[PDB]
């Protein structure tokens, strides 16, 4: 899931991961792959 | 309690350099007795902060004058918060202009009553009391709904009985959620 904007984790445990200048939020639930960078 | 530093260099360029350091301008006032004295913020704040420290005096330590004072004015900073000028008065026996902190309870008979809720209107009372005013004058009434409101009338006065404000003008009242 990509959205060059917003991304505020969600899935309770949902993780905010720095990655190559990219705000890529990672969860153990595929259901949140928050990509915006 | 409170403590400050005298304003030799006073009035303008000073107040500014003041803000600079982290000192905001202040006045020490008593009947026609005044001193342009200056405020060290950080703590000045903590103090004011007590708020109790805003409705009820504290003791000022300037040079070595442990004396009695409260605040009447404060040019508080338009552009955000923090003020631009603090004003205090030192008392003797006769303090009339009294803004005594007033706490109360509509004795929960509103929300868990009509869903309705309570609006604090006055909160404090500027009545009279000779440097002998309670830091918590208070009132109550398990009536917290209907076309219901309560005022200075009913009020319910303490040891220092003196209303320097008006004859009942609504301490506050209850308005409905989406009503009951």
């Amino acid at each position: 899931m990509k959205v060059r904007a917003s991304v505020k984790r969600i899935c309770d445990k949902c993780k905010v991961i720095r990655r190559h200048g990219r705000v890529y939020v990672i969860c153990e639930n595929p259901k949140h792959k928050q990509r915006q960078g | 309690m409170e403590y400050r530093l005298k304003a030799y260099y006073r009035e303008g360029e000073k107040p500014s350099a003041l803000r600079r350091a982290g000192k905001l301008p202040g006045v020490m006032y008593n009947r026609h007795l005044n001193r342009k004295v200056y405020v060290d913020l950080v703590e000045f704040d903590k103090v004011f902060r007590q708020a109790s420290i805003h409705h009820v005096i504290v003791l000022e330590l300037p040079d070595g004058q442990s004396l009695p004072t409260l605040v009447r004015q404060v040019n508080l900073d338009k552009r955000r918060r923090r003020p631009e000028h603090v004003d205090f008065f030192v008392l003797s026996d006769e303090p009339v202009e009294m803004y005594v902190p007033l706490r109360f309870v509509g004795t929960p008979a509103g929300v868990r009553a009509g869903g309705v809720l309570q609006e604090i209107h006055r909160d404090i009372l500027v009545k009279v009391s000779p440097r002998n005013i309670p830091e918590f004058i208070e009132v109550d009434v398990s009536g917290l709904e209907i076309g219901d409101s309560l005022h200075a009338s009913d009020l319910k006065l303490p040891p220092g009985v003196e209303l320097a404000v008006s004859p009942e003008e609504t301490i506050a009242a209850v308005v409905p959620p989406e009503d009951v």
Binding site: - | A51, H54, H55, R72, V74, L76, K78, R79, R80, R81, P83, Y99, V111, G115, L117, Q118, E119, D123, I124, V126, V175, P176, P177, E178
Partner: protein, 136 residues
């Protein structure tokens, strides 16, 4: 919005600061770096709060639909009598006292605003009473 029975046609252009800062319930909603603000939008925030609030404990207010906006034309050319009073809104620029009640107690009143505001048109902020207020 509201601003019934005016007096005049349409004001004009300017903006710089104002004079609202106090509070009225401790559900503190305060502008910061604006200018105009669409009444409509306003409601937007209004409603936002209104429903977030488990639907009930009724908020307060602040500003007003204030002035009359004109785009005049329709798409035209320009030089007509600049007629048409198409829009209505407030003029708040120096963080103004936008204050409103329910009984959230905490970040729910927070959210409510946070949103309503995010919603509004500008970099702005919110808070609670930190410098009581003395009247006559």
């Amino acid at each position: 919005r509201m601003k019934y029975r005016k007096q005049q046609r349409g004001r004009l252009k300017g903006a710089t600061k104002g004079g609202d800062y106090v509070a009225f319930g401790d559900y503190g909603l305060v502008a910061l770096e604006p200018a105009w603000i669409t009444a409509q939008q306003i409601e937007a925030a209004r409603v936002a709060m209104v429903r977030h609030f488990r639907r009930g404990g009724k908020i307060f207010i602040r500003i007003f639909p204030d002035k009359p906006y004109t785009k005049k034309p329709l798409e035209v050319r320009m030089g007509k009598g600049k007629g048409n009073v198409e829009g209505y809104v407030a003029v708040v620029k120096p963080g103004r006292v936008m204050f409103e009640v329910a009984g959230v107690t905490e970040e729910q009143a927070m959210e409510a605003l946070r949103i309503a505001g995010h919603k509004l048109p500008i970099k702005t902020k919110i808070v609670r009473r930190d410098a009581y207020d003395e009247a006559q």
